[PDB]
Design goal:
Keywords (chain C): Plasmid
Shape of chain A: elongated
Strand content of chain C: 5-15%
Order of helices and strands of chain C: EEEHHEHEHEEHHHEEHHHEHE
Largest sheet of chain C: 6 strands, mixed
Distance between the termini of chain C: 77 Å
Structural class of chain A: alpha+beta
Domain Tail sheath protein C-terminal (chain C): 240-345
Oligomer: part of a larger assembly
Number of helices of chain A: 6
Radius of gyration of chain C: 23 Å
Protein name (chain H): Afp16
Number of strands of chain C: 11
Number of strands of chain A: 9
Helix content of chain C: 25-40%
Largest sheet of chain A: 5 strands, antiparallel
Distance between the termini of chain A: 59 Å
Organism (chain H): Serratia entomophila
Number of domains of chain A: 2
Helix content of chain A: 10-25%
Protein name (chain C): Afp2
Radius of gyration of chain A: 36 Å
Order of helices and strands of chain A: HEEEHEHEEHHEEHE
Chain lengths: 275, 149, 349, 149, 149, 148, 116, 55, 49, 148, 49, 108
């Protein structure tokens, strides 16, 4: 829609500037290397990303086709316009009645064919020190140049993300015991410690807990999915696999503090890695 | 989410320089304009059981600043700060609108109700500086509103 | 009739009650179909007392009129009169009804209450008891065979005899202690010891009569006391299971399941992906921390009180993401009332 | 020690620019967002025998700042600071999440419970500057939490 | 609006350097001149029904600053701060006009009524700086007016 | 979400918005204080140990109001000048905390039979940017709080 | 008695008639100082913020009804709101305001009883 | 080619004390009863502006 | 901090009100209306648990 | 638009602009305070419950003025030195809040029969940049407020 | 240099947190999101080895 | 870089080499070798160079840290680089990537 690419900015700089510059000069888009024509030579010199105009955009959705939209970036284009020609030396130059209708085109176009851009027309940024370096890289020939800055959004690549909208929502609230996952985890440690130097053995195992919803709970009976991770000695990993396996399918829970009865669905144990 | 269901064109924020200010019944070209803020100051009530209550309070009086160069001719900002006798001062509306590129469409404007001047500075009469002689005027008012169109 | 601009005098005896409502008590005063005193509108809304005596300008004595009049004099906002054969139609249509009160009504309100509970509208019913006196040789399993065995109802035996002499159905006394408790202490506190003013029970209940009706189907006596007079005395539903005993914890999970349902319907048409499962999980979590803070849950950390899970391998499947279904499973611990205070005395220090 | 027992891949911290903010029930594109701090203030008790007792105290109220450019159209931050009568203000949730590169995965988010506005500045209406017109809004809330996923 | 009904020529503000200052009965060439401000200080009266009353108050005394290089010859700014005995000081008019390019037309001027000196600094006698020795004098007066011609 | 109709029910009330109904007229005041309800104390002790503590009789409130001096007619001078040795027009004072529009009462402090006992002039100072504020003090018999 | 010569429900009561005389005239004398402006969209703004500033001084001193300024008045002036392009080109600015005023309490009915 | 103003009409008419906010949020549960319907019309908005209503 | 268990308590036996002060109304103040009641009793007891 | 002729009608008056007419002459003062109107209180209680509250008799005002010491003739010493055991020239005090030009009264506080009871010397201090200020206190019988 | 020898260390005894800032969520800066935590403790010692 | 703590192995008992992370700083041009139209051959190639950069804020090296096109260069600074090329100006696109590089490996 509004995403104008970078060739679309050069074509926007030729429609705005043909209308004021005389019909038989030229509009050129490089630096000249016997030129035999005047050729004002619009020249682009950096395309850095404009940080000051980006926001915290949130990657919009479609919800009719169910697809995420590509989240653009917006760069700044930085042209500069000269007048190569190739005596003329009068106050009414041929070289300055062309540069009088170049800036008259810029002055009138603070809003291009790209009507949703953001333009700085002729900023004060350059200096005789800085112009003196550019006049050497041309090959030691100074001119009168007019800088002109434009930012524009450029969209990302397009692939089918294909998320789906929500359209329905289920909420089920069940009673639980007043155990924290902290009160559960630190009860399974000295529950396990008695299940076995054992305090030295299971020092670096951690066994974080998260309470499963327990579809028909009670005021007691919290139900918990474990994941055990960490480090243990060589010999102790084998007896701990039995006390994990009886917790997973146990008739009467596991260690329960003061009648709560914590239950376990999955021991997991992927990361124990006994040395 | 940007759930518009179709691609929406991007907008850039409109620049500071393209604005327009009318004191009231006339339009004046200024250089700068600041301090048009809506400010509340909160009221709190902490409680022993532990519920904090946070509320807005009164809305504070704005302190608007306006600056402008010194021109040959009639000083219209002095003829309004001259005419004060002890509480008598002619209050005025202020509107600082924010136009488009051509200036023929107001986009967002800030409205100020009874602004009277409190100060008016002199320029910095510095002989060693090739620079415009500006002067600031500071207003005080009672409310600031925003209308968008 | 007002004619001239002065000050007028009259002595027509009128009454008017103020409104001190709570949003979690919007009842449904179901009345019998065998009644010609009522206006033939099948469903009608009564936002305050000064509108109820426009439709019914003369004081009746019938069971729908001593039920509403004992409602509005304890605060009470909007509330409904529906025929006993239309309460399933009105629960499904007004979306804020939190109570069904059988104002002297049975044998089909008991039926159509069981209709809307299976459809899951999160309603709490308030029923009646026997109108003539239970003997004492009653064998309580023969009296509460009539009543549903759902956890969403309670029964409240002793009928009312308010000051004009007329009868009050005891679903209105028990709904009058819910206006003054949801206003004052919240929906999680039991509606029992709140005093309902301007009514007296028809009969009298000794402590040894209530003791056999306490466990089982829980007949929920209305008893007078010196001090807190004519309170309701008992706060149990029609099921003695260890999670849906106690009237207040049931209404505490009605209002939780409905305030999360009305706060998260404003998240439909979002993408059913991982940023949505976050702003679900922080919208539920912000609500229950406002609820834990005002003394409604148990445990002294927010990890002690609730949990919530929503996501990819937690509670849903890829078969259910692609057809839309968001499943949000919450578990939360509520408080219990102290029902029995055992004083054991001695002689030694 | 980095005792993972095998080589662990390195992580770099995620940049400030890729974030996302929703006031509550809508998503708003901002430019800056600051001041979402958990702050306690200590309580002390020095003793004659010499044991110092240091404790946390209350947790202080946050003062969040949000800035955004001024766009043509409806000012959604003004319609929420306009609608105040003396303590009445509609509180809102704030979530400032911090996504990955594509933006389809929330990584860390900061949750704010009852934020109401206290101020809303005007832009700096400076005619001598080719620059975006921004405006800051300052909120006050009661708690800030972090959830990680 | 610029409703003059025909095109009006543009004006640029006149520079700071082309000014002219006379203490009173003589013309003195200075380098800088500052602080010629009209300043009021407000009086307020808030009310229970809610109407705020905002008014000007007294107009504050100006504190003018003037600087000048140190020349060989008579110090005319010292002979006016020397001649003080305990309240006796010879007050003077100050006019700081603001001329055109040739200097033969006063455009805007600032008039000061009874200015007496309060301070007179020494130069910064720094041996490591190839720089003019200046000295500031600070005046206090009672009113400042502007006349335009 | 706090939904500001709930702020009008369960948040407290500030003290900067109030209407003073003075007899049958509304007069704008700046400050208002001293609308207290104070009792005395009766005590009785015997030799056995019984202390008997009782409320006494409540004494008179002293209400002080203050408003600014306006160029028109001084209504508070015209009510303290009409004293003839006993004879004063008693008035009913109503000081109501109001909404921001000014049209409905949140909570009110009523004062039954008030009459002026003092009226202070403003303090004239040539070096001060202040408003001329008169301060009247009243004496009554009863303070009533109506809440609605 | 404070009634006019017409018992219609908007122009009964003498005060609400004089309240709309002075509104219609204080907006007519405050907006004639905006003639010879261009009849375009910046003018329709500074009309709409000059009417709105006057009525907020009027709502604040207890002259309108409703407890928000959205409850009290509205104003519309513009292109498709109240004018046409046939009327912009011949000059005509039409500014249509609507505002709610208060009513007096005319009858105070005291109804006494015997029971408490 | 804009035109000057040269004439100005002002007409002030009585209105009800409804805000456009009080109007819009009454049309939502007015519509909601006109129909899961709360889930349906969640993301419709229906802003209001009061027409002058000539009499 | 949860509000559910007593650390130390100060008990007061037979209290009755002797005064009740109105808030100080000021049009230039952002404060909350605070009533202050004073009580008179016979015994102060400290229970610690 | 506030149109400053309306400020002269409905805005309050500050306290920095005042003219003191002292007998038949105008004397420039810096401060002026104490022009109060104070009454006493009569009370009467019976056993049935009737409290009777009444204004007493108004007591004398004590007005204090202060001005600076000027090199000429001291007019306030010449009026407190002419005391012979009873005999003092009583004067009429008029303290009028005035416009900025000084030519018309906004509101005035009149004082009937004032005579000096004290006159304080300035506090001499070698380390102070202040003006020598005498402070005279007056005693009268009536305070009148005329508004025009 | 290798990190296998501690040279000088600073020891802190009972440090608890008092604050935890958020990052500066600035969209106009290609920069790491940091967060500071401020601790309060009771003594600091130095051991050298 | 942080205060990393030189991780251990504890199964083979060996200290792991503690890396460093350097920043690489590419810049992309277009040499070619008239074309002079707004739809250049030289700029429809530099339109698909930055389109590759814009899409790749995260490379095949998915654990890098990239600045895509920073605003850092200047016409003074570009004017020096355009001379060291031999006095021929072009349009360049800078692109910054950091990446960890591990130390040498010996058996600790």
């Amino acid at each position: 829609s509004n995403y104008q690419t970078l060739v679309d900015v050069n074509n926007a700089m030729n429609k705005m500037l043909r209308a004021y510059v005389n019909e038989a000069v030229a509009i050129r888009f490089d630096l000249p290397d016997t030129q035999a024509d005047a050729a004002i030579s619009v020249f682009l010199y950096d395309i850095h990303e404009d940080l000051q105009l980006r926001t915290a955009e949130s990657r919009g959705f479609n919800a009719g086709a169910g697809r995420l939209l590509p989240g653009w970036v917006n760069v700044k284009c930085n042209y500069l316009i000269t007048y190569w020609e190739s005596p003329d030396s009068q106050p009414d130059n041929q070289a300055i009645q062309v540069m009088s209708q170049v800036l008259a085109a810029l002055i009138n176009n603070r809003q291009l064919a790209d009507i949703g851009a953001y333009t700085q027309v002729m900023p004060p940024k350059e200096n005789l020190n800085s112009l003196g370096n550019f006049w050497q890289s041309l090959g030691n020939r100074p001119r009168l140049s007019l800088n002109y800055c434009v930012t524009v959004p450029i969209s990302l690549s397009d692939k089918g993300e294909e998320m789906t909208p929500v359209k329905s929502l289920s909420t089920t609230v069940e009673p639980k015991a007043p155990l924290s996952p902290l009160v559960i985890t630190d009860a399974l440690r000295e529950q396990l410690r008695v299940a076995l130097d054992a305090c030295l053995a299971m020092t670096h195992v951690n066994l974080d807990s998260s309470p499963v919803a327990n579809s028909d709970g009670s005021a007691a009976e919290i139900r918990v999915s474990l994941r055990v991770y960490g480090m243990t000695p060589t010999e102790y990993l084998a007896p701990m696999n039995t006390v994990f396996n009886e917790w997973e399918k146990s008739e009467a829970a596991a260690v329960t503090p003061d009648g709560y009865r914590v239950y376990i669905n999955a021991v997991d144990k992927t990361d124990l890695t006994g040395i | 989410m940007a759930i518009t269901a179709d691609d929406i064109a991007v907008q850039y924020p409109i620049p500071t320089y393209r604005f327009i200010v009318t004191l009231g019944d006339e339009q004046v070209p200024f250089t700068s304009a600041s301090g048009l803020d809506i400010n509340f100051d909160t009221i709190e009530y902490r409680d022993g059981t532990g519920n904090w209550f946070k509320m807005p309070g009164q809305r504070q009086a704005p302190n608007i600043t306006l600056s402008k160069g010194v021109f040959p001719g009639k000083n219209a900002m002095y003829e309004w700060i001259n005419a004060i006798q002890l509480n008598q001062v002619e209050k005025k509306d202020i509107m600082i609108s924010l136009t488009n590129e051509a200036g023929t469409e107001v986009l967002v404007s800030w409205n100020v109700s009874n602004a009277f001047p409190t100060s008016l500075t002199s320029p910095s009469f510095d002989a060693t500086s090739n620079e415009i002689a500006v002067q600031q005027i500071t207003l005080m008012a009672d409310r600031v509103t925003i209308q968008t169109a | 009739t007002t004619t001239y601009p002065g000050v007028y005098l009259s002595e027509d005896a009128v009454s008017s009650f103020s409104v001190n409502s709570a949003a979690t008590a919007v009842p449904l005063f179901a009345y019998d179909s065998e009644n010609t005193n009522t206006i033939n509108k099948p469903i009608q809304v009564f936002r305050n007392w000064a509108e109820f005596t426009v439709e019914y300008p003369t004081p009746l004595e019938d069971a729908f009129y001593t039920s509403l009049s004992l409602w509005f004099m304890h605060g009470g906002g909007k509330c409904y009169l529906v025929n006993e054969a239309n309460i399933a139609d009105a629960v499904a249509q007004y979306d804020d009804i939190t109570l069904i009160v059988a104002a002297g009504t049975d044998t089909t309100t008991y039926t159509a209450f069981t209709t809307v509970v299976g459809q899951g509208y999160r309603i709490f019913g308030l029923f009646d008891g026997p109108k003539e006196k239970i003997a004492g040789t009653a064998k309580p399993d023969e009296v509460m065979e009539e009543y549903p065995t759902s956890p969403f109802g309670a029964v409240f035996y002793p009928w009312g005899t308010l000051a004009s002499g007329a009868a009050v159905p005891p679903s209105a006394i028990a709904a009058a202690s819910i206006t003054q408790t949801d206003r004052t202490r919240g929906v999680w506190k039991a509606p029992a010891n709140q005093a309902v003013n301007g009514v007296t029970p028809a009969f009298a209940v000794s402590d040894d009569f209530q003791g056999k009706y306490n466990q089982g189907k829980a007949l929920n006596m209305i008893r007078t006391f010196s001090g807190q007079g004519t309170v309701v005395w008992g706060a149990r539903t029609l099921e003695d299971s260890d999670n849906w005993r106690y009237i207040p914890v049931r209404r505490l999970f009605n209002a939780v399941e409905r305030d999360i349902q009305k706060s998260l319907n404003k998240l439909v048409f979002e993408p059913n992906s991982q940023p949505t499962w976050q702003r679900v999980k922080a919208a539920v979590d912000s609500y229950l921390h406002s609820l834990w803070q005002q003394g409604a849950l148990a445990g002294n950390t927010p990890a002690d009180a609730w949990f919530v899970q929503v996501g990819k391998d937690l509670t849903m499947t890829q078969e259910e993401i692609n057809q839309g279904k968001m499943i949000i499973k919450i578990g939360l611990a509520a408080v219990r009332p102290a029902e029995f205070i055992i004083l054991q005395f001695s002689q030694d220090i």
